[PDB]
Amino acid sequence: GTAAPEKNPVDVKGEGNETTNMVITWKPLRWMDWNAPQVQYRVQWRPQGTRGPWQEQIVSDPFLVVSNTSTFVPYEIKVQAVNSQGKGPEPQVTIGYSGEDYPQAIPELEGIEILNSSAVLVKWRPVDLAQVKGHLRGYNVTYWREGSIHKDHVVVPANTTSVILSGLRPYSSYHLEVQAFNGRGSGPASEFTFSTPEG
Ligand SMILES: *[C@@H]1O[C@H](CO)[C@@H](O[C@@H]2O[C@H](CO)[C@@H](O)[C@H](O)[C@H]2NC(C)=O)[C@H](O)[C@H]1NC(C)=O
Ligand SMILES: *[C@@H]1O[C@H](CO)[C@@H](O)[C@H](O)[C@H]1NC(C)=O
Ligand SMILES: *[C@@H]1O[C@H](CO)[C@@H](O)[C@H](O)[C@H]1NC(C)=O
Ligand SMILES: *[C@@H]1O[C@H](CO)[C@@H](O)[C@H](O)[C@H]1NC(C)=O
Numbered sequence: 001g002t003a004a005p006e007k008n009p010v011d012v013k014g015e016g017n018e019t020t021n022m023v024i025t026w027k028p029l030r031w032m033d034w035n036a037p038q039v040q041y042r043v044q045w046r047p048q049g050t051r052g053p054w055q056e057q058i059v060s061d062p063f064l065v066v067s068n069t070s071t072f073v074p075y076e077i078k079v080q081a082v083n084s085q086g087k088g089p090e091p092q093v094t095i096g097y098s099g100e101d102y103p104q105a106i107p108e109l110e111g112i113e114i115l116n117s118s119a120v121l122v123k124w125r126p127v128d129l130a131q132v133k134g135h136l137r138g139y140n141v142t143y144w145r146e147g148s149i150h151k152d153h154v155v156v157p158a159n160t161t162s163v164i165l166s167g168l169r170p171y172s173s174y175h176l177e178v179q180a181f182n183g184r185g186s187g188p189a190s191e192f193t194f195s196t197p198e199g
């Protein structure tokens with residue numbers, strides 16, 4: 001009656017919570033697919049694209065911690081179900097990542113356009129993703145009035161590289177910071193100044 005497992009697990013994912021690890025997880029197979037009273041998981045992984053053979057470990061838990069990784073690098077991951085009668089299908093491959101670090105990227109100014117005495121348009125260049133040290137989640141635009149300390153800020157998505165700042169006091173000097181952020185946190189701030197005209 002017993003046979004090899006019917007299917008391999010779904011929802012394979014690799015994500016670090018430290019720069020030196022990657023946690024591989026998956027949905028345990030439903031018992032009807034074990035074809036056996038126990039099932040284990042053959043986990044294979046390697047840094048993406050290396051001729052070196054796959055690292056491999058068999059576990060019964062639906063997760064595996066890969067340690068001693070470089071910071072935010074891609075890994076190829078295969079998870080095959082196995083039991084005493086044999087192995088599931090040849091598995092599909094998922095890309096996972098070791099853990100994120102703070103970005104090193106610092107946004108560069110494209111321009112600050114003065115719109116009115118109460119509004120400006122801030123434009124920056126898209127950061128280089130290789131310096132994000134993680135998945136780019138957005139930008140944070142911090143600004144405050146010096147005069148002419150309450151600090152305001154505007155969070156935009158990762159796809160967005162300008163923002164209008166409204167409700168500014170007229171004839172005032174403002175400081176402005178722009179930071180990229182990933183899942184770990186924000187990078188260093190590029191630091192700018194602008195003045196609103198009279199009103
Ligand atoms: C945008 O910048 C603000 C500060 O201008 C950041 O605010 C901090 O958020 C953390 C949560 O991760 C809090 O623990 C701190 O107390 C906050 N500090 C201040 C001074 O507000 C905020 O993290 C940034 N937003 C994003 C999405 O990175
Ligand atoms: C990271 O995830 C692993 C696996 O779940 C866990 O053992 C470890 O405690 C986690 N570390 C932190 C700092 O949350
Ligand atoms: C960390 O990874 C390196 C990768 O080159 C490997 O050679 C070594 O086994 C690991 N070192 C430690 C101290 O865990
Ligand atoms: C200032 O410019 C902003 C941004 O375009 C706009 O929403 C607002 O209506 C303008 N204010 C005035 C008084 O024209």
Ligand SMILES: *[C@@H]1O[C@H](CO)[C@@H](O)[C@H](O)[C@H]1NC(C)=O
Binds near residue numbers: 157158159160
């Ligand atoms: C990126 O661009 C468009 C317009 O802002 C938006 O519909 C899309 O959802 C954005 N992405 C995210 C993750 O918000």
